Amino acid sequence: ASRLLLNNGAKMPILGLGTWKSPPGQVTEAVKVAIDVGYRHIDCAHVYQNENEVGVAIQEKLREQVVKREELFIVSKLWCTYHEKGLVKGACQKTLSDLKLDYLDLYLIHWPTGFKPGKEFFPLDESGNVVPSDTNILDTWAAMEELVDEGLVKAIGISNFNHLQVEMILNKPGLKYKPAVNQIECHPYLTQEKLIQYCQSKGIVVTAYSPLGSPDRPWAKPEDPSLLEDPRIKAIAAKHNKTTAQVLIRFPMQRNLVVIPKSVTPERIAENFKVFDFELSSQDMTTLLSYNRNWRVCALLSCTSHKDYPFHEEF
Ligand SMILES: NC(=O)c1ccc[n+]([C@@H]2O[C@H](COP(=O)([O-])OP(=O)(O)OC[C@H]3O[C@@H](n4cnc5c(N)ncnc54)[C@H](OP(=O)(O)O)[C@@H]3O)[C@@H](O)[C@H]2O)c1
Ligand SMILES: O=C(O)Cc1nn(Cc2nc3cc(C(F)(F)F)ccc3s2)c(=O)c2cscc12
Numbered sequence: 001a002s003r004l005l006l007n008n009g010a011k012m013p014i015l016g017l018g019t020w021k022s023p024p025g026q027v028t029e030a031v032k033v034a035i036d037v038g039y040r041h042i043d044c045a046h047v048y049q050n051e052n053e054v055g056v057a058i059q060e061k062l063r064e065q066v067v068k069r070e071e072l073f074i075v076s077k078l079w080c081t082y083h084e085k086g087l088v089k090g091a092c093q094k095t096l097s098d099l100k101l102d103y104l105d106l107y108l109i110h111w112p113t114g115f116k117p118g119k120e121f122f123p124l125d126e127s128g129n130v131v132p133s134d135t136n137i138l139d140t141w142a143a144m145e146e147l148v149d150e151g152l153v154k155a156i157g158i159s160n161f162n163h164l165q166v167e168m169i170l171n172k173p174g175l176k177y178k179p180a181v182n183q184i185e186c187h188p189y190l191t192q193e194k195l196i197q198y199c200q201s202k203g204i205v206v207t208a209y210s211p212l213g214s215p216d217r218p219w220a221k222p223e224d225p226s227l228l229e230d231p232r233i234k235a236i237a238a239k240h241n242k243t244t245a246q247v248l249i250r251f252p253m254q255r256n257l258v259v260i261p262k263s264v265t266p267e268r269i270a271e272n273f274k275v276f277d278f279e280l281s282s283q284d285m286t287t288l289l290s291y292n293r294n295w296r297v298c299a300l301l302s303c304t305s306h307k308d309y310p311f312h313e314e315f
Contacts, residue, residue, distance in 0.1 A: 014256065025026045041258075047186050055099040079110055081115045106180060112162075149176075181253075196255065207259070208252040211260070246275050
């Protein structure tokens, strides 16, 4: 509808605002505008290095009595350098301190790969390989469950897990909480049908990231594929008298996914919200699904030999 139910009974807004690459100097105004426009879900992470500034916006709007806390669905994520069981609570509390909140709605394992603990987000050796840590997804999951038990987070989940990694959590001895959500890259050029079918079949809500193809990702080249400029998608938009962004946001919604487009531009933040008053046809949905090229925006070559690297599997 406009929300999907999670395994804890919470209603997750199907549309949220993404914050990766939203600079600290611009993000506060972006989140204020988004809340005004009607977004009730913000996707955050410690590695985005902007949680303080998102927190400022949230507090402004709570103080303005625009929203109360219970009407917001705030997501953040545990960065790769904090997979050690003993570091998880501190990481969560730092995020909470930065966001100026007392709890998160959802806290995710950001990637299945643990990285060497320390002050660098991407610890590299002298040949530029990311340095891994002696951590594993099951032990980290156990530490995530403690956060629920402690009341710091309402729901926990995973991000960028392949179907075997999801399976490993579900099959964990002594599992206490099933993951609520798996947040994965999803757009017409990477449709993920098998992994979505798997996750949904298992009662895990899927959130689609990079739904516009992340045209501002820092490793994009001007010649790379571009969803917003794909003339085939432009045609589908024109037929509905919508923008290509609206089509791209609507597409995951009709697959029963949560979607989290990012913008720091007020006009676009508003534009991107106007997706609840039209429907893509069956033909439109099939056509968009047929553009799948297994083209992935978010992967790092410097991690491909990690034991937990998620993208060697078919799904
Ligand atoms: N879990 C993970 O590992 C992971 C990985 C990637 C992303 N994510 C999450 O998913 C969110 C969304 O993915 P993303 O940031 O990679 O990219 P995205 O949402 O696919 O694309 C954002 C880009 O599209 C532009 N844009 C947005 N609305 C527009 C519109 N209506 N017209 C034209 N251009 C438009 C933005 O420009 P402006 O901002 O300048 O307006 C920005 O350059 C992230 O911010 C983050 O919250 C999670
Ligand atoms: O992690 C995000 O949400 C987006 C993101 N994505 N990436 C690309 C990444 N790919 C991976 C791949 C892995 C893995 F699991 F495949 F090894 C782990 C961490 C990363 S981060 C970045 O380099 C980066 C710098 S700040 C935010 C990012």
